[PDB]
Write a structure and sequence with these properties.
The complex is a heterotrimer of chains A (about 100), B (about 270) and C (about 10).
Chain A (H helix, E strand, L loop, with lengths): L4 E6 L9 E10 L5 E6 L2 E2 L4 E2 L3 E2 L5 E9 L7 E6 L7 E4 L5
Antiparallel strand pairs in A: 1-2, 2-7, 3-4, 3-8, 5-7, 6-7, 8-9
Chain B lengths: L2 E11 L9 E7 L2 E7 L6 E2 L2 H6 L2 H28 L8 E11 L2 E11 L2 E7 L4 E4 L5 H9 L2 H28 L6 E9 L2 E11 L5 E6 L2 E2 L4 E8 L5 E9 L7 E6 L7 E3 L2
Chain C lengths: L9
Classes of the chains: A mainly beta (about 100), B alpha+beta (about 270), C little secondary structure (about 10).
PDB class: immune system
Keywords: MHC, immune system
Assembly: trimeric
């Protein structure tokens, strides 16, 4: 199983109107080619940063994508992942926990 | 005991792909990214403030040449390997990792291994001064390397060069490497389909190792719990979340317990 | 400090 294992989370415990960083982390996949996009209401977010290609002890790859954001209530934040082992794009939704 | 590690990993891809560098090398000191090279910039660049502040231009210069040297070597290696496997095209990867660990100042291990398409190909056994061929296709490589005394060359690097520089890096970044930052913890409950899923998130802790456990009425409960493992933030700190399934309205009986080097006693948190 | 990796056969 070399599909991307994906998690979505924020740098800080989130609050409405407070500046934060949205993270999408994919790991344990192969081949290393992968598409990872942070989305706000289905629209790609600006200022996204991509970690240089890295891998673990078991040769499986990983990648972090993060962007500064200010979480708005009534807005939906997610992470779109595309990979060869995936038949269709997988969307992982951020739980704001507030 | 004081443990320190130096680890370099190197990736060569035929299919990076779109707008991505096909060759990438990075280095880690005690698990922390501190240098980077790729086929786009064709130069080594700092990834931490402590290496940026302490290294001179001769260092970056010196590293860039080896980096450019490695890029060309793996460019050929990609070609050499697909022809060995009688492959004509497609998506392929070459992966190297090497480095050393020191304990109380002295080296305790040194490693040098590579993989083709995500599987073991060859690995240096510094003990028997031998390269282990993981697959039959690697036997020609094993032979020529030992033939040209590659074991002596890598024994020298792993036991002298790697150790010497790791000791330097540790001194350069002692203050940052040895720091401790508290996690910010939030417990959040969500009820759906007759199940109360309690989640516990620890935000922004350093160093990486941490244990987050669920307690019910004061007893450690690792039954219906699931962990996302330890995942990175963008700023060199880390994150983890653990969930547990409970009955509706029974949230008060559960505590999240966090064990981390920044905390004198385990932290206890509730919904 | 890095080092040059090996050439395959």
């Amino acid at each position: 199983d070399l599909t991307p294992k994906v998690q979505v989370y924020s740098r800080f415990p989130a609050s409405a109107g407070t500046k934060n960083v949205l993270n999408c982390f994919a790991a344990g996949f192969h081949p290393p080619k992968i598409s990872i996009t942070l989305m706000k209401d289905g629209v790609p977010m600006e200022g996204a940063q991509y970690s240089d290609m890295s891998f673990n002890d078991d040769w499986t790859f990983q990648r972090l994508v993060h962007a500064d954001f200010t979480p708005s209530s009534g807005s939906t934040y997610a992470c779109k992942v595309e990979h060869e082992t995936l038949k269709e794009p997988q969307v992982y939704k951020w739980d704001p926990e507030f | 005991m004081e443990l320190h590690t130096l680890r370099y990993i190197q990736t060569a891809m035929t299919d990076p792909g779109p707008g991505q560098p096909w060759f990438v090398t990075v280095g880690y000191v005690d698990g922390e990214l501190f240098v980077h090279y790729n086929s786009t910039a064709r130069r080594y660049v700092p990834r931490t403030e402590w290496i940026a502040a302490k290294a001179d231009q001769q260092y970056w210069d010196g590293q860039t040449q080896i980096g450019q040297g490695n890029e060309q070597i793996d460019r050929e290696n990609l070609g050499i390997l697909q022809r060995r496997y009688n492959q004509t095209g497609g998506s392929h990867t070459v992966q190297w990792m090497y480095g050393c660990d020191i304990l109380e100042g002295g080296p305790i291990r040194g490693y040098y291994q590579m993989a083709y398409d995500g599987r073991d190909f060859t690995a240096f056994d510094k003990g028997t001064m031998t390269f282990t061929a993981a697959v039959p296709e690697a036997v020609p490589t094993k032979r020529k390397w030992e033939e040209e005394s590659e074991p002596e060359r890598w024994k020298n690097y792993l036991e002298e060069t790697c150790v010497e520089w790791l000791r330097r890096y540790v001194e350069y970044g002692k203050a940052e490497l040895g720091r401790r930052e508290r996690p910010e913890v939030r417990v959040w409950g969500k009820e759906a389909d007759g199940i109360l899923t309690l989640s516990c998130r620890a935000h922004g802790f350093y160093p990486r190792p941490i244990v987050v456990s669920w307690l019910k009425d004061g007893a450690v409960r690792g039954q219906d719990a699931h962990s996302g493992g330890i995942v990175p933030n963008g700023d060199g700190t880390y994150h983890t979340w653990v969930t547990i399934d409970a009955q509706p309205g029974d949230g008060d009986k559960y505590q999240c317990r966090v064990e981390h080097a920044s905390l004198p006693q385990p932290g206890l948190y509730s919904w | 400090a890095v080092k040059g990796v090996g050439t395959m056969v």
